[PDB]
Design a binder for this molecule. Structure first.
Ligand SMILES: O=C(CO)[C@H](O)[C@H](O)COP(=O)(O)O
Ligand SMILES: O=C(CO)[C@H](O)[C@H](O)COP(=O)(O)O
Lengths: 209, 214
């Protein structure tokens, strides 16, 4: 019946296709994981089109713990080890062009700095107010997380392989469920899709990335 | 200027007394640090009376990076050292945490309250907490706002001065457009949500004036 609720966004393959196009157009999407996993919907944006206004929306509508999903190669490049001996690294801040690091603009500056393919460890102070996540190799076919869905979506869309996520939260602090996620998506012109949709699509189109 | 804007909340001593009373009554307060420092206002709540609705407000109106201010002793008993050994205002983040039990994903208002009360428990054991997580503990410096003029110390000092458990939560008030709230917006927020506004300088002077060594 999640399946049935999502029918106004199309069938599974169409739900992926439209999410890919929204991303290529610099818009965001809403990605749900398995109902028996976190059963949460995250706003997802591409780093390369990311704006202050998009970041502000995440902060105002989501948990506020905005994460940067990176490939393992990029995380390694940044010398970001895991926070602890979900693949949270130590937290990060831009050294240049920010103040406290927490404003929407500051977080976006931090994020663009980290996602740069020419980035260096020393571009980033640690700890900070952006929370990077290492996407596992293989993506959603290997681990069915929002982290992997984020990076696969960018890759599948032909975009810089870095994205930001944050979990949609209702005003009263409870986590948003499918009906709320659907309404939020229609109000914000953001396609909704599931991790399972992405799994099926990758295989259906022989998408090794 | 900031003085004249704050004068409606009363003189510096009164501003502190009203905040201490708010906390004793289970309500929140708004704490500003120095204008030449972060120049930001944090919502502050006592852990011992913390509710889901209070947490929910912080998530709506603040950065969403809700931090738990702990004594160094409490952080040690949880096995929470500094997140980074060579910290690049020297904010004393530990590794992030989650309740081991009694939560699902950790991020809902209710789950963050559960993690926070689990962590702040003075009989807490390290295994009560998973790491990493979605609550951000901060190690307050010994000596409080007379050691470091931060929101972190302000939070723990306010709890001690009010005679509560020395554990509080903070989060930075954010404007609808993503920029951080400044004094005028913090003042309006306080008057809208019935939260006393005070500054770190108020706390410093209060503590000196009232021989409050803590
Ligand atoms: O923990 C989280 C990051 O703060 C969120 O639950 C987010 O959805 C990423 O998790 P995953 O990749 O496991 O789905
Ligand atoms: O970094 C922060 C928490 O994530 C905020 O800026 C917080 O106010 C830090 O407090 P302090 O004033 O103690 O540095």
């Amino acid at each position: 019946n999640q399946s049935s609720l999502l029918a106004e966004f199309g069938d599974p393959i169409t739900r992926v296709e439209n999410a890919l196009q929204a991303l290529r157009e610099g818009r965001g999407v809403l990605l749900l994981d398995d109902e028996d996993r976190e059963n949460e919907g995250d706003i997802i944006y591409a780093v390369e089109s990311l704006t202050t206004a998009q970041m502000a929306l995440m902060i105002r509508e989501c948990s506020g713990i905005v994460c940067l999903c990176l490939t393992e190669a990029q995380a390694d490049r940044l010398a970001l080890p895991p926070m602890v001996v979900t693949a949270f690294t130590v937290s990060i801040e831009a050294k240049h062009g920010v103040t406290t690091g927490v404003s929407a603009q500051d977080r976006v500056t931090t994020i663009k700095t980290a996602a740069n393919p020419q980035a260096k460890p020393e571009d980033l102070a640690r700890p900070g107010h952006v929370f990077p996540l290492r996407a596992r190799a293989g993506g959603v076919l290997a681990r069915r997380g929002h982290t992997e869905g984020t990076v696969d979506l960018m890759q599948m869309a032909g975009l810089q392989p870095a994205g930001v996520l944050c979990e949609l939260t209702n005003p009263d602090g409870s986590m948003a469920k499918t009906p709320e996620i659907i309404e939020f998506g229609k109000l914000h012109n953001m396609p909704v899709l599931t991790i399972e949709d992405m799994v099926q699509y990758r295989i259906q189109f022989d998408l090794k990335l």
